[model samples]
Target: LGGLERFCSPGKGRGLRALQPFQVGDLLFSCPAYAYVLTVNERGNHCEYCFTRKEGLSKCGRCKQAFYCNVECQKEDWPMHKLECSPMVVFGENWNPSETVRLTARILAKQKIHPERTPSEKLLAVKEFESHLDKLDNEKKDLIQSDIAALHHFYSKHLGFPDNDSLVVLFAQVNCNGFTIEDEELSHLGSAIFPDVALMNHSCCPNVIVTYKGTLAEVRAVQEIKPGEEVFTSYIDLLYPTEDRNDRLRDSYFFTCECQECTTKDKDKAKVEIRKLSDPPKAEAIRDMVRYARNVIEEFRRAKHYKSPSELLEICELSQEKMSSVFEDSNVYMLHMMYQAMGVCLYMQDWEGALQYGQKIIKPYSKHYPLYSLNVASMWLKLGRLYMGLEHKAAGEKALKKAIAIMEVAHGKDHPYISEIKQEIE
Candidate 1:
């Protein structure tokens, strides 16, 4: 627990206490998700792949909030978590977030005089409760509620539910899963191990970063971390031009961010503030927005929502004059957004604007999302369908098969997500 103490975030208060002031590659917390809920929201709850949701149940024995469908799954997954159990369980469920900070403060106070939350520690602390940490104060809640109320009223009078909380969550990639009453059947977290990630402050250009090594999660410094640094992580899509990123963050989270990158966004919104040159208006706008949206999309991708990529594609298409101009060979952002959007459209038979976008993104996506993510593989299946629809049978088969291969990495053959993709691929 000494290691956990060094990480008591000074100003922030939440269930976050770093055990040790960690190094760049230090292991943060490699634990399973606390619980999964059944969501009716557009994104839907439960893993897009397994659907073995907890819906707020009892905590896993050793980890913070991880609940298992069965002892078998927990035990089978034990190898992945056995060693890290102690520090995780040091503070159990129902742990008060403030106390969590208190615990962390104790650790830090002991570690030879330091000032505040540093970047490396900040990154570690965030990924610590990376599972589900949504904390909002009363005033913040009220403000957002007021906005949502105003927006809701406007929506009732103006827009409408294919676009409800579900749609936005999907668009946001948050997957609220039809906000239900907090689970009563399951025990509430008593006050020990609270959601630490909720307390992590945001920065457009975060000081720390999180990357994975197998099931293990690590939060490392992207650059050298110094003492007294107020650590930050980008809770929103940092890749976006500052304006769009700030727009989404304020719209959703309500913090008026003063992060380094955001503050410096200037009139440029970060599309080119730090760098130089001007992008053509349409391509620049599209590139900036699409880049922002997709980065946010990854958050949703991790959350397991978004029925298809077409919505994202629509968002992306709005960014450029000719989608092709934006997505040619080296356009990284276009490449990433194009594949998923294309696949989603093709799978849904949305050929009007689907095939072309699909064709653009598919090739490049293969290079980016790697050969693992279901999201990436899902793109392949969609691409196959689009190709076949356009009468390119061979290309379609290739992409679809690629999707199947990727799906096998985690779900193997029988996973439901694999089935969902197969249904479309065939």
Candidate 2:
């Protein structure tokens, strides 16, 4: 950890502190994942070893499940894949395991082989990670128990499987600490655990941002920080109001945030502002709309697996129409629906529809999220691609440039993904 030191953060327990000053866009550190498992949806499209997306991927000859960009990637991933390949063959369709169970299996396997922490793991060992097991309710505890059962059923023959008590603790730690490795467009590609990156604590107004390059986690300064300042990265989405954000944090990470943004509640009004309405709606009416929007959003999430693209787009339009009467286009709730609509439109190849929603989101997304947010950067990337696809060269270049400006800071100017995006501009 070149410029970072682990220190006991006040109220927040252990956290990383900057040893030297860092300006915006400065790379603080990068840590490789101890173990990672790709999402089921990305199975055929992305390389199992390098996590790259491309056409004509090769299938694993043994399991006939995992796909790779080339033979080199397959060979490189063999050490990890070997543990699952035979098991996958034996079980056939029963080979399915939750991402957590699969990732836990890999972590356990690596622990036995290495039997020692890596240099980055020295900063924060996997065993030392807080499990918050005592804080968990029975419902959460039972979920862990089920995951452990799955682990045993799937990996019993594999080497280095841990005992029941230890597995329970490890699963709990992973629940709180595991990072979702997402692609440049913010789609989930996999799940990973980085002990070093896990050392940093959460803040609604984070000073640093975490981005992924393949399975490697990169931490960069989003705000200027001086020596001795504690580094913070948001554990939850920052677009929501204070109460909603803290609600998510408490539900997921088992902590209430006292970050400056949460305490002051300065951005709450802007987050849910009603711009189109002249007079304030009745309090009861506002509550009714909130409940409606929440239900629609929840329904939309579940519907994604079974619904047609047109059906999903219709759900989005109905929600947006209802939300527009009470919530501003800049409101987080409205933005959520718009983003979903854009994705649905893209899926349907309705480029104009996607472009329309994308244009509405770009401004509000920039305003609500942190200045160097990957969310905003990804939105710009989407719009740029949409514009270019629709033959608007100048607008496309402008949007792509905006994306490059923010991504260069969050992802670093040297990342391969950044090079790919630059090629698009050229």
Candidate 3:
């Protein structure tokens, strides 16, 4: 029934390994979310239950917070949503639960109702997830405390709230193991936990790519894997240089990756290379750029909470302009800013502006990401839509075909979304 088996992966502890040979584009495994919560921003546009995107969604009459495609979807999600619905009505606007907190609540509720783990969850139980509590510094611990406080505040009225110690451990586990489910265009739709999918360990240069079909996590091989080879998937974004990547890994997952990409640093120079320079940039200069890039990226992230689309676009443009002097257009930092700019333009409905930024992104995205990467495929999908919107039929067809080629490999040829894309092409 499965092509993967669990085994000890040397220093990495437990990890998924191939039980049979698999070619690129072959399915490694697929897992359903044990529990998931839709992001607040996606509430109106995406169905709170099945996560299908549609217009004119109906809202729950009681809480009026959860939106659904129809009554059936609402009824189906009731067992999960019932826990939060009343609190949402009581607290009203004050009923603020971060996605993680909400997910934790649903998980607790699910555990109470059905204590037995499904076949998939039995591979790696939720309780078995590593908390890495010892590695967490005070600041991280404080955040967890705040989440616990919120959990108590929102869920205390509900039965079966776990004890403080167990709550703390679960919160830490969710922080590190939770998966962000993004749509085809890479917008965050929800957060989930798939214990089986979580078993695949980290690799900077991963052999498999994971994509979400609604709440289901699909793992597809991007490189050929022979029997007995370990299955590896990246835990962090692969665009950054070794130092930045490892910094994120150590801070969150609490492990320094010794993957070949980290050990050799072969792609580090190219990721940060300048377009034209008489002399190579000094280590100090590159360090400054890294610091600047991270600060601005964080700023962009925070600003999204309040900033207008134009304001966010301005931030992206200014950051890109400054970075252009020190780095090539293909530099990971520049590409990062360009992507943000494209997203803002799309939000603003400025198709031409989005197309410009997306055009600049495609080459570098293909160069940097692994073959059959959803990142590159999504960019092509966006570019194709942009072209179609602008009445550039020939270009739209070409871009969409490119997207289909990659997506067929990563998302499977028979996936419903692929058929939808084919319909768009016709």
Best-first order by TM-score:
2, 3, 1
Give candidate 2 misplaced runs (Cα > 4 Å).
Answer: 275-279
Q: Tens-digit lDDT track for model 2 on 1-426?
A: 767789888888799999899999998999998888888889999999889888999999887999998999999888788878899888988888899998988888888877688865959999899999889999999999999988888887665565788888999999989999998889999999999999999999999999988888999999999998999999988888888888789888888998899999888889888765567788898889888887787898888979888788888888898878888888889999999999988888999999999999999888888888889999999999998898898999999999999989989999887899888874
Instruction: Please say which candidate is ahead in TM-score: 1 or 3.
Output: 3
The TM-score that candidate 2 achieves is 0.96
Error of 2 at 306 (Å): 2.2
Worst 10 residues of 1 by lDDT: 176-185
Q: Give the CA lDDT, 0 to 100, for residue 6 in model 2.
A: 92
Q: After superposition, how far is residue 69 of candidate 2 from its true place, in Å?
A: 3.7
Task: Provide the RMSD of all predictions against the true structure, rounded to 1 decimal.
Answer: 15.1, 1.6, 1.7
Give the number of the best model, judged by lDDT.
2
Better of 2 and 3 by lDDT: 2
TM-score per prediction, in order, is 0.39, 0.96, 0.95
Backbone clash pairs in model 2 (N, Cα, C under 3 Å; residues 3+ apart or in different chains), count: 0
User: Which candidate leads in TM-score?
Assistant: 2
Model 3: per-residue lDDT, tens digit, 116-214? Answer: 887558578887998987788989889999999988888766746767888889999998789999887778899999999999899998998898888
In order, what lDDT does every prediction score? 0.42, 0.88, 0.87
- Report the candidate with higher TM-score, 2 versus 3: 2
